[PDB]
Design an enzyme around this catalytic site. Structure first.
Site, short mmCIF file in Angstrom:
data_model
loop_
_atom_site.label_atom_id
_atom_site.label_comp_id
_atom_site.label_asym_id
_atom_site.label_seq_id
_atom_site.Cartn_x
_atom_site.Cartn_y
_atom_site.Cartn_z
N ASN A 1 20.32 -4.16 -5.70
CA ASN A 1 20.19 -2.72 -5.79
C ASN A 1 21.23 -2.11 -6.72
OD1 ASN A 1 18.38 -3.38 -3.73
ND2 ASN A 1 19.86 -2.85 -2.14
N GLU B 1 11.05 11.52 -26.36
CA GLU B 1 10.97 10.68 -27.55
C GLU B 1 10.46 9.27 -27.25
OE1 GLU B 1 12.00 13.27 -30.49
OE2 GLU B 1 11.44 11.16 -30.75
N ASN C 1 12.78 -9.81 -9.16
CA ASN C 1 14.08 -9.97 -8.53
C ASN C 1 14.44 -11.45 -8.39
OD1 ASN C 1 12.03 -10.37 -6.73
ND2 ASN C 1 12.75 -8.88 -5.22
N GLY D 1 0.79 -1.22 0.00
CA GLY D 1 0.00 0.00 0.00
C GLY D 1 0.82 1.27 0.00
N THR D 2 2.12 1.16 0.27
CA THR D 2 3.06 2.25 0.05
C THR D 2 3.83 2.12 -1.25
OG1 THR D 2 4.53 1.09 1.55
CG2 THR D 2 3.38 3.07 2.38
N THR E 1 6.67 -12.39 -0.91
CA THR E 1 6.74 -12.22 0.54
C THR E 1 5.43 -11.72 1.13
OG1 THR E 1 9.14 -11.88 0.53
CG2 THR E 1 7.90 -10.97 2.37
N1 LIG Z 1 16.27 -4.34 -3.96
C1 LIG Z 1 15.62 -4.40 -2.81
N2 LIG Z 1 14.30 -4.80 -2.80
C2 LIG Z 1 13.62 -4.87 -1.64
C3 LIG Z 1 14.26 -4.53 -0.46
N3 LIG Z 1 13.38 -4.68 0.54
C4 LIG Z 1 12.21 -5.09 0.03
N4 LIG Z 1 12.34 -5.23 -1.31
C5 LIG Z 1 11.25 -5.65 -2.19
O1 LIG Z 1 10.07 -5.07 -1.69
C6 LIG Z 1 8.99 -5.98 -1.78
C7 LIG Z 1 7.96 -5.70 -0.69
O2 LIG Z 1 6.84 -5.09 -1.28
P1 LIG Z 1 6.64 -3.50 -1.26
O3 LIG Z 1 5.87 -3.06 -2.46
O4 LIG Z 1 7.97 -2.82 -1.23
O5 LIG Z 1 5.88 -3.20 0.12
P2 LIG Z 1 5.85 -1.72 0.76
O6 LIG Z 1 5.11 -0.74 -0.10
O7 LIG Z 1 7.24 -1.23 1.02
O8 LIG Z 1 5.06 -1.86 2.15
P3 LIG Z 1 5.74 -1.38 3.52
O9 LIG Z 1 7.01 -2.14 3.78
O10 LIG Z 1 4.79 -1.59 4.66
O11 LIG Z 1 6.06 0.09 3.39
C8 LIG Z 1 9.62 -7.35 -1.66
O12 LIG Z 1 8.94 -8.28 -2.48
C9 LIG Z 1 11.06 -7.15 -2.11
O13 LIG Z 1 11.27 -7.75 -3.37
C10 LIG Z 1 15.58 -4.13 -0.47
O14 LIG Z 1 16.13 -3.83 0.58
N5 LIG Z 1 16.27 -4.06 -1.65
MG LIG Z 2 8.07 -0.26 3.78
#
Ligand SMILES: Nc1nc2c(ncn2[C@@H]2O[C@H](COP(=O)(O)OP(=O)(O)OP(=O)(O)O)[C@@H](O)[C@H]2O)c(=O)[nH]1
Ligand SMILES: [Mg+2]
Ligand SMILES: Nc1nc2c(ncn2[C@@H]2O[C@H](COP(=O)(O)OP(=O)(O)OP(=O)(O)O)[C@@H](O)[C@H]2O)c(=O)[nH]1
Ligand SMILES: Nc1nc2c(ncn2[C@@H]2O[C@H](COP(=O)(O)OP(=O)(O)O)[C@@H](O)[C@H]2O)c(=O)[nH]1
Ligand SMILES: Nc1nc2c(ncn2[C@@H]2O[C@H](COP(=O)(O)OP(=O)(O)O)[C@@H](O)[C@H]2O)c(=O)[nH]1
Ligand SMILES: [Mg+2]
Lengths: 440, 53, 428, 431, 428
Positions: free
Chosen positions: A228, A254, A206, A144-145, A179
Site C-alpha cells: 500500500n 494533457e 501485486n 463485484g465491488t 485469490t
Molecule cells: N494492497 C492491498 N491489496 C489488497 C488488500 N486486500 C485485498 N487486496 C487485493 O484485493 C483483491 C481482491 O479482489 P477485489 O477486487 O478487491 O474484491 P472486492 O471488490 O473487494 O470484493 P469484496 O471483498 O467482497 O468487497 C486481492 O487479489 C488483493 O490483491 C489490502 O489490504 N491491501
Molecule cells: Mg471487500
C-alpha cells in the site's frame, strides 16, 4: 487551484486509499486532526494544500475523498482508527453486504439502492471547488465491488461532467495466481462500459511487488501493508505537478493526448526508481545516468511478463527532486542508442519528461532511506497483450460448462453479456497488434 | 484434557513466549517475520538509518 | 449485519450445538450470567451476529432449543452455561417418537412445528440484515435428520437468497449406531440437497484417529470431539465478527464455493493441533501450518484425498502473518500436487486472512475443502439401501402414515443422481 | 578512465581477490568502511557521501568461500549484491558447471557486468582469476567469457592463474579440466593465465626462508605481481605502460596467448638489508631457473620475447646496462628471428608491502614477464596424463552423464596435439 | 542449502545412530534438552545442515529411527541423548524379522515400508535444496539389512539424482555372528550395488585389532567402538559445515573417487588415534599423521590392502595448519609405493582441508581409500555361499515366504560380477 476528486470504492483500493492520506499530511504541516501543531502555524500565505485538501476556518483542514463500499467492516476502522479526526462524516457510506462477486450485487440489486447518495456527494464536493481537473478512483479489477461497482460510478460522472480526466490506483489481476476464484471471469465485466470512459489504469500486479521487496528492499516475505505504501508513493508523484512547481509541469487534461494513441490503448506502468534501503544507498551513488536505466531494468518494472519481448511506445519519465536538465538528455540519448530497448518504429516522438523541485517524501515507519532523486515511469508498452491473451482465455476453459454463472443468473444478471463482452475483449487484444506491425 | 485446540494462554504471555529466540533464530535459519528487514552490523560513525545519502 | 439464526435438533446436534456456545462465548468475554468480562476491545463491536442484548446491561444468545424428547433440553438447563438462554423458546415436550420419519412430518411433528417456527419467525422479523441459518443435526435417526428437513422446508418458501449453514455427522463405514439408518438418511436427501448450502459433513470414525495419532489420546470421550467440531464452527465466522484483510460473508463463501447447484458439502479441519509431548519439539510457521491443513489425517470426515480432485479448497487463516507467505505457499501446495486438482479450473485455492485469531495459540488456522472424493461416502450408503431393499424390510411402520414404496425407490436415485455427476465431472 | 573491472571466479579465484583487494585498498588511504581516516579512480566508484566501493563481482557456486567475505571485516566495503553465490557446488564437473549449474546464475552475473561498466567512462580490460582444476574454475568461466566476447568484442580480457602443480596436484580428474579450459577458451582469449605453483612453494623455501607456507602466505606474493602490471595506471612514470599494450607485445601468434610471469626481488627480512638490490643485480636475478615463479626448465626453450617492469628508483642507463648484460651473455637463448627481446617498464612509486607479511620494503623491484619455447613441453605431458586416463575411458561417466557428448574429449586432444606440433614448428632455426 | 537427512535401521543402526548424535550434537554445543547454550559463533550458521529448530531456541535433529522390534527403539529414548528426536518420528514394527529378509522386506516390512516414507518425505521436503541421505546398517542381520535394501530402493525412484550415502558393517572372517550370513551379504549386494551412490565397508575384527595393538585398551565394551565408527562418520561431512582453505564436500569426492560406477565400496580409517597411556609422549605433526594413516594397522577392514593396489585415495586434514606439508607428504606416499598404485592413473592421491578440529583434539585427519584386494572380501563372502547353497542348507526358512530359488543365484552372479571387475582392472 488544480483540484481533483479521490473516491475510494471497493475494498482493495480503499485500503491503499487508507495509505495515501498519511503521505500527504506528512508533506505539509497538517496533522491527522488538521491542526498545525501549535508552531509552524501558517498565517495563510501559501496555498500548497489545495490539490488534495481544503480549509475550514477554525484551523482544521479538511481532505477531499469519499469512502464508499457496501462492506461494513473495512470503513469501520477509519471511523475509529488513527484517522477518524480527518474526514467529513457524511462522506462515509457503509452498508450491509459484501460484493460476493455477483455483478448485480454491485450494479442491479444492491448498488441500485445507493446511487442517489453517492452521486449527490461528488457534485457536493465539486461546487465548493473552483476549477476541476480529474478524478482519483481507487478500484481493483477482481470483485463485484472492485470491478462491478466502479462501472456504476464511472458511467454517471461521465454523463454529469463530460470532459474531465480519470485516474486509478489499485491492483491488476496476476496471470498465474490469485485469490478470488471467479476472477478469470470477473474483470471482463467492467470493460463493457468502462473503455469509452476510462483514460487511465494500472498495468500489472501485486505479485511482482513481492519480488522488489525481496531484492531491492532488504526485507524477506512481506505483508500487504508494504504494497500500500509503494503504490501510495507514485500517487504523490503523478499528482505532484498540481501543487508543486518546477520546470515542466503537466495538468491532468494533457494526458488524454500524451498517452492515448487510438481510443482503446490508455494505460500506464508505474516504477519508482531508487526503492532501496539504507544498507545499499550508503554504498551506492544514484545519479541520473542510472536511475533512468533503473526504471528500464527488466527487474524493477512491475511486470509479470517479459519486457524484452516488448516494444516501448510512449514513455513519460516524470522526474522529481534535485535534478539538472542536462543530465536528462544525456540519459535519454543514452537510452535510445541501446539496442535492447526496442521501440515503436512509426513514433520517434516517444519521450516526455517532467522536472520538479521537491525531494522524495519519506514516511516514518518503513524501509526507505532518504534519496535526493526519484522518478516515475508511466510507460505505454507492447508486451502486455500477452497478459490480456491469457485472462480472457482463463474465461474460455470454464466456458464449456459455464461454472460459477449460477449466482449471476441467480441474482439479477443475465447470460447476455458473457459472449458480447468476450469478443469485445477479443477486440481489445487484437487492436494493439493489428496496428502493431502495419507500416513496414 | 479435553481442550488443547484452544489452550488457556493470555495474549501477552502467548506473544512473549512465542517470541522466544532473540538472535539465534535468524542466524540459524531464515526466521521470517511479517514485514521485517535484515540488519547487517555496521560501524558507529559509518551507517545511520536515515541521513544525507 | 451478516446475520445467522440458530437452532438445534436431534440428540447429536443438541450437544455440539450446546458445545457451540462454550467456544464462542470465551472469544467474546461473556460470563454465563451475561456480564462482559473480556479485557480486549474487539469482542463487543460485532456481538449482535449471534446475540440479542438483554435489558439492564446483560447479554443473551439467539437460538431455539428444540427436540421431541425432553431429557436433552433438561440436561442442558442443568449444564455449564445453561442459564444464558431465553425460557420462552424451549419447545420441549415430555412425549417421544420412535425414530420414524412418517409420523414426524405428518402427525407428531405437525402439532409441534408452528410453535417451533413462530420463534424462528420472532427473532427474524425484528432483525436488521438477516443472511443465514444454522441448524445442528445428524444424518441418521428419525429425529435428527428426520426433522432437519422439517425445519428447512417452510423457510425457503419465503426467504429468497438466504444461505443456510447446517452441520451433519455422517454414518461411519465400519460400525453402526442405528439399524434403520440408510432407511432414514436418504429420506432427508430428497429435500436437503434441494435446499441446504453448507453441510459440514463429519465422520465419527476420523474423529477418533486424530485423537489416536496426532493428539496421542488413547480415550477420546464425547467431551473431546464436540470441542474438535466446535473449532470449525467458529473458524468460518471469523470474517463475520472481526476485522481482516480478505473479508467474505456466507454468500461470498458460497459464490466462490458452489459451482453447480447440488455439490456444496464441506469438510472441516483445524490446523495447529498437536499432542502435549511433542509440542515444544514442533515450531510452526505459515509453511509449517500449511502441512497440517493439507495433511492426510487432519480431516474430520474420513475419505481418501488421493482418490479425488479438489474443486475449491478455501482455508481461512487467523492471526498476524505475511501475505506473500499466504499466497506463495498456497501455490506450492498446488504446483507440487498437480494431478489431484481439476484441470478445468486454473486457480483451485482461496485464502482468507484475519486480524484477531481464536484463542489458544498465536497463529491459528482452519481448513475447509470441497473435494470430489466423498463419492465413496455416497457409494456405500446408497448401496446399503438397495442391497437391503431386495427383501422389503421395514415398511410396516412407515406405511401406517402413508410412506409408500413409490417414494423410497425414487429417493435412492436422488442419492445416485449425485454419484453420476461426480463421475460425470471427475473425467469432465 | 584507464580503468579495469575485476571478476573473481571460483574458490580458487575469489580467494585470490581476498588478498588482492587487501592490497589495492591499503595501497590507497582507504579504511574498509570507505572513509579516509583522484588518481585512485582507476578502480573505485565514489558516492556523494564519501564512500569508496571497488569494481568487483564475486562469483562462486559454493557458498562457503563467499560467506567468509561477507561476515568478516570487509562487510562495509562491498555492496552486498556484488557477492554472487550459488547453492550447489560445481563439484569439479563442467558438465555440471557450465551446462546445468551455471545456466540459471548467468543472468545475474551479466547484469552486474553491465551495471558496474555502465558507470565507467572508457575501459580497456577485465580481470578474471581462477585455477585450471575446478569445474567452475574450468567451465563456468568459459560460459562467463563466450558471452563476454559476443557482448563486447574487441575490448580486452586479462586473466591470471594459480595452476595446481602438474607433477603433484589435488584431483585425479584435474587433467580433464585443464584441457577444456585451455581448449574452449582458446579462441576468445587475450593475454591470459599463468603456470603452476610448485615453484611458488620452492621460492617460498629458498629465497623466502620461512618453512611451511599456507595459501594465505602465497597470496601475499601473487598480488605483488598483478599490482605491478597496473602500477602505471594510477601513478605517472618516465615510461608509462597501457594495459591494452600487452596484447601486441607478448603474443607471437594468436593461438599462443600464455605469457608467463615472475617477480625477482623476493627476499626475507633478515637477508634484505645486508646486500644491494641493484638494477644490474635483480635483472641478473630474473634469468636463472632457480629464481622463477615458473616450474619448468627454461633451458629447453629459446626465449621469444620478455617484458621487464621496474618499480621505484631506477635510472634507465642501468636498464640499458642490464639489457646489455643478458644478450651478450652466452647461456641464455633469445630466439633467432627476434632481435628485439624486451619491453621496458619503469615507475617511481615504491612497491607497497602488506603489514604482517614475510616480504621486505625494497627500494627497487622488477616483475619479469616472459614467453618461453618450453611452454609446449608442460603442455606435452599434460595431455599424456590426459592420454593415460582416457585410454580405458575412465571417469567419463561423471561428465557424459550430464548433457555433454561422448567424443568431445578427442576433439580437444587432437586440437591440443594440433597445438603441440605446430608450436614446435616455430622453434627450429631458419636459414 | 546442502542439507542431509538421516536414517537408521536395525539393532546395529540404532546403537551407532544414537552415538553419532552424541558426537555431532556436542560438536555444536547442544545439551540433551536441545537448546543452544554454547559460547562460540561459528557453530550456528551451518547447523541447518543437520537440525531443524524446535520453538524456544531448542534444536531438534533431522533424524528418524526404525526397527522391527520395538525394544531396540526405546533403548535409545531412555538413554543420555535420546530426548531430542521428536516422538512422531519413532516408526517401528511389532514382531521381529527373525534374521530373515524374506521376512524383513518382502512380507513383514512391506506394510511398514509403505508408511515410513511419510516421515521421510516430510523431513526431506522441509529443506530449500537437497544433497543426500544417510543410513547406518550392517550386512549380516535381517531387520536392518533387508529393510535397508528396501529403504534405499523407494528413495531412488523419487530422488533419482541425490547422493545417498549408506553406511555398512560387513560380516567377519573368522568369528561369525549368525549362522546365515552367507545368505545375507551375498544377497544384500543386489540392492546395494545398483542403487546406492556411496557405501563404506567396516569389519568388526579390524575394529577389534585396532583396539588390540595400537590402542592397547584393556576392557572396552561396544561403547568406544561406537565412537570409532563415529570418528570417520562426520569426517567426510565436516567440509559442509565449516570453512576451509580447500573444501571438499560429498559431490567433490563422488566425482573423484569412483572410476567406474559399479565400484562404490570403500575402506575407511582415522589418523590421530593414539594409545591412552602413551598420549603424552607423542608429538603430532602433519607427516606423522600420514605414516599412521597409510600403514595397515589403521585400515578398518579385515582384508589386507598390502596384497593389492589402491585406485583413488583422499584424506582431509582438519584444523589450523600449513599446506606445503600437505603436498609433499602426499607426494611421499605416492612414490613410496609404486606397485600399490595403478598404471594408468598418474596421480592417485587426493587432498582436502578444514579449519576446525574435533572438540577434544588439537588437529586431526581421516582416511578414505579404494583398494584392489577388497575383492578378497568379496571372494570370501562368495566362497562361503558356495558351501551352503550346493546342498540347499538353509533355503526352506526363506523359501516359503516368497523368495524363490532363482533369486539367490542372480545375486550370486552379481556378487561374482564384482570380484571379476577388480581383477581385470588390477593388472592394468
Ligand atoms: N494492497 C492491498 N491489496 C489488497 C488488500 N486486500 C485485498 N487486496 C487485493 O484485493 C483483491 C481482491 O479482489 P477485489 O477486487 O478487491 O474484491 P472486492 O471488490 O473487494 O470484493 P469484496 O471483498 O467482497 O468487497 C486481492 O487479489 C488483493 O490483491 C489490502 O489490504 N491491501
Ligand atoms: Mg471487500
Ligand atoms: N595461492 C592460492 N591458490 C589457491 C587458493 N585456493 C585454491 N588455490 C589453487 O586452486 C587449486 C584448486 O582449486 P580448484 O581446483 O579450482 O577448486 P575450486 O576453486 O573449489 O573450484 P571448484 O571445485 O570447481 O569450485 C589449488 O591446488 C590451489 O593451487 C588460494 O587461496 N591461494
Ligand atoms: N459427537 C457426538 N455424537 C453423538 C452424541 N450423541 C449421539 N451421537 C451420534 O449420533 C449417532 C446416532 O444418530 P442420532 O444422532 O442419534 O439420530 P437421532 O436419534 O435422530 O438423534 C451416533 O452414531 C452417535 O455417534 C454426542 O453426544 N456427541
Ligand atoms: N559398532 C557396533 N556394532 C554393533 C553394536 N551392536 C551390534 N553391532 C553389530 O551388529 C551385528 C549384528 O547384526 P544386527 O544389528 O543384530 O542385525 P539385526 O538383528 O537384523 O538388526 C554384529 O555383527 C555387530 O557387529 C554396537 O554397539 N556397536
Ligand atoms: Mg570448489
Amino acid at each position: 487551484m488544480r483540484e481533483c476528486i479521490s473516491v475510494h470504492v471497493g475494498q482493495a483500493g480503499v485500503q491503499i486509499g487508507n495509505a495515501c492520506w498519511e503521505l500527504y499530511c506528512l508533506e505539509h504541516g497538517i496533522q491527522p486532526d488538521g491542526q498545525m501543531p501549535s508552531d509552524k502555524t501558517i498565517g495563510g500565505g501559501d496555498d500548497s494544500f489545495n490539490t488534495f485538501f481544503s480549509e475550514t476556518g477554525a484551523g482544521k483542514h479538511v481532505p477531499r475523498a469519499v469512502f464508499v463500499d457496501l462492506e461494513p467492516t473495512v470503513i469501520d476502522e477509519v471511523r475509529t482508527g488513527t484517522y477518524r479526526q480527518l474526514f467529513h462524516p457524511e462522506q462515509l457510506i457503509t452498508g450491509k453486504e459484501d460484493a460476493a462477486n455477483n455483478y448485480a450485487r454491485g450494479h442491479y440489486t444492491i448498488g441500485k439502492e445507493l446511487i442517489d447518495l453517492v452521486l449527490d456527494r461528488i457534485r457536493k464536493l465539486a461546487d465548493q471547488c473552483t476549477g476541476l481537473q480529474g478524478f482519483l478512483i481507487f478500484h481493483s479489477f477482481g470483485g463485484g465491488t472492485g470491478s462491478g461497482f466502479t462501472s456504476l460510478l464511472m458511467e454517471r460522472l461521465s454523463v454529469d461532467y463530460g470532459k474531465k480526466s480519470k485516474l486509478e490506483f489499485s491492483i491488476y489481476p496476476a496471470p498465474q495466481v490469485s485469490t478470488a476464484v471467479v476472477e478469470p471471469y470477473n474483470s471482463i465485466l467492467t470493460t463493457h462500459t468502462t473503455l469509452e470512459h476510462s483514460d487511465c489504469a494500472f498495468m500489472v500486479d501485486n505479485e511482482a511487488i513481492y519480488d522488489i521487496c525481496r531484492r531491492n528492499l532488504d526485507i524477506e516475505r512481506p505483508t500487504y501493508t508494504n504494497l500500500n505504501r509503494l503504490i501510495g508513493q507514485i500517487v504523490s508523484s503523478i499528482t505532484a505537478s498540481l501543487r508543486f512547481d518546477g520546470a515542466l509541469n503537466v495538468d491532468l487534461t494533457e494526458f488524454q493526448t500524451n498517452l492515448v494513441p487510438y481510443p482503446r490503448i490508455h494505460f500506464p506502468l508505474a516504477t519508482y526508481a531508487p526503492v532501496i534501503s539504507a544498507e545499499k544507498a550508503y554504498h551506492e551513488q544514484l545519479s541520473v545516468a542510472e536511475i533512468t536505466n533503473a526504471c528500464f531494468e527488466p527487474a524493477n518494472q512491475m511486470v509479470k511478463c517479459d519486457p524484452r519481448h516488448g516494444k516501448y511506445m510512449a514513455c513519460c519519465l516524470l522526474y522529481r527532486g534535485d535534478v539538472v536538465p542536462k543530465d536528462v538528455n544525456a540519459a535519454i540519448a543514452t537510452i535510445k542508442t541501446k539496442r535492447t530497448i526496442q521501440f515503436v518504429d512509426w513514433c520517434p516522438t516517444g519521450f516526455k519528461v517532467g522536472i520538479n523541485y521537491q525531494p522524495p517524501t519519506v514516511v516514518p515507519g518503513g524501509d526507505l532511506a532518504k534519496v535526493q532523486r526519484a522518478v516515475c515511469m508511466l510507460s505505454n508498452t507492447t508486451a502486455i497483450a500477452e497478459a490480456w491473451a491469457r485472462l480472457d482465455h482463463k474465461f474460455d476453459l470454464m466456458y464449456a460448462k459455464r461454472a460459477f454463472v449460477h449466482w449471476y443468473v441467480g441474482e439479477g444478471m443475465e447470460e447476455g453479456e458473457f459472449s458480447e463482452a468476450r469478443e469485445d475483449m477479443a477486440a481489445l487484444e487484437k487492436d494493439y497488434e493489428e496496428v502493431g506491425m502495419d507500416s513496414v | 484434557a479435553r481442550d488443547m485446540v484452544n489452550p488457556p494462554k493470555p495474549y501477552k504471555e502467548v506473544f512473549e513466549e512465542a517470541q522466544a529466540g532473540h538472535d539465534l533464530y535468524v542466524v540459524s535459519h531464515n526466521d521470517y517475520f511479517v514485514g521485517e528487514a535484515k540488519n547487517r552490523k555496521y560501524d558507529p560513525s559509518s551507517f545511520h538509518r536515515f541521513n544525507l545519502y | 449485519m451478516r446475520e445467522i439464526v440458530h437452532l438445534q435438533a436431534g440428540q447429536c446436534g443438541n450437544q455440539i450445538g450446546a458445545k457451540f456456545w462454550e467456544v464462542i462465548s470465551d472469544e467474546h468475554g461473556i460470563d454465563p450470567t451475561g456480564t462482559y468480562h473480556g479485557d480486549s476491545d474487539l469482542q463487543l463491536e460485532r456481538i449482535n451476529v449471534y446475540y440479542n442484548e438483554a435489558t439492564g446491561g446483560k447479554y443473551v444468545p439467539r437460538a431455539v432449543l428444540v427436540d421431541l424428547e425432553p431429557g436433552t433440553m433438561d440436561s442442558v438447563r442443568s449444564g455449564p452455561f445453561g442459564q444464558i438462554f431465553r425460557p420462552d423458546n424451549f419447545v420441549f415436550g415430555q412425549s417421544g417418537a420412535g425414530n420414524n420419519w412418517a409420523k414426524g412430518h405428518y402427525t407428531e411433528g405437525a402439532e409441534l412445528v408452528d410453535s417451533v417456527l413462530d420463534v424462528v419467525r420472532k427473532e427474524a422479523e425484528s432483525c436488521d440484515c438477516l443472511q443465514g441459518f444454522q441448524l445442528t443435526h445428524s444424518l441418521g435417526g428419525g429425529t435428527g435428520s428426520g426433522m432437519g428437513t422439517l425445519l428447512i422446508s417452510k423457510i425457503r418458501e419465503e426467504y429468497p437468497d438466504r444461505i443456510m449453514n447446517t452441520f451433519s455427522v455422517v454414518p461411519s463405514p465400519k460400525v453402526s449406531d442405528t439399524v434403520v439408518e440408510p432407511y432414514n438418511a436418504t429420506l432427508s436427501v430428497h429435500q436437503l440437497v434441494e435446499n441446504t448450502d453448507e453441510t459440514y459433513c463429519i465422520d465419527n470414525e476420523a474423529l477418533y484417529d486424530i485423537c489416536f495419532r496426532t493428539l496421542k489420546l488413547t480415550t477420546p470421550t464425547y467431551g473431546d470431539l464436540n470441542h474438535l467440531v466446535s473449532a470449525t464452527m467458529s473458524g468460518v465466522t471469523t470474517c463475520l465478527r472481526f476485522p481482516g484483510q480478505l473479508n467474505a460473508d456466507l454468500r461470498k463463501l458460497a459464490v466462490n464455493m458452489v459451482p453447480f447447484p447440488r455439490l456444496h458439502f464441506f469438510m472441516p479441519g483445524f490446523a495447529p493441533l498437536t499432542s502435549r509431548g511433542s509440542q515444544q519439539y514442533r515450531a510452526l510457521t505459515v509453511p509449517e501450518l500449511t502441512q497440517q491443513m493439507f495433511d492426510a489425517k487432519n480431516m474430520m470426515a474420513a475419505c481418501d484425498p488421493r482418490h479425488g480432485r479438489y474443486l475449491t479448497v478455501a482455508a481461512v487463516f487467523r492471526g498476524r502473518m505475511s501475505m506473500k507467505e499466504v499466497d506463495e505457499q498456497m501455490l506450492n501446495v498446488q504446483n507440487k500436487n498437480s494431478s489431484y486438482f481439476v484441470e478445468w479450473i486454473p486457480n483451485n485455492v482461496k485464502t482468507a486472512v484475519c486480524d484477531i485469531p481464536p484463542r489458544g495459540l498465536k497463529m491459528s488456522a482452519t481448513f475447509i475443502g470441497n473435494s470430489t472424493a466423498i463419492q465413496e461416502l455416497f457409494k456405500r450408503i446408497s448401496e446399503q439401501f438397495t442391497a437391503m431393499f431386495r427383501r422389503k424390510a421395514f415398511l410396516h411402520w412407515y406405511t401406517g402414515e402413508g410412506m409408500d414404496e413409490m417414494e423410497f425407490t425414487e429417493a435412492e436415485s436422488n442419492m445416485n443422481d449425485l454419484v453420476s455427476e461426480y463421475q460425470q465431472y471427475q473425467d469432465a
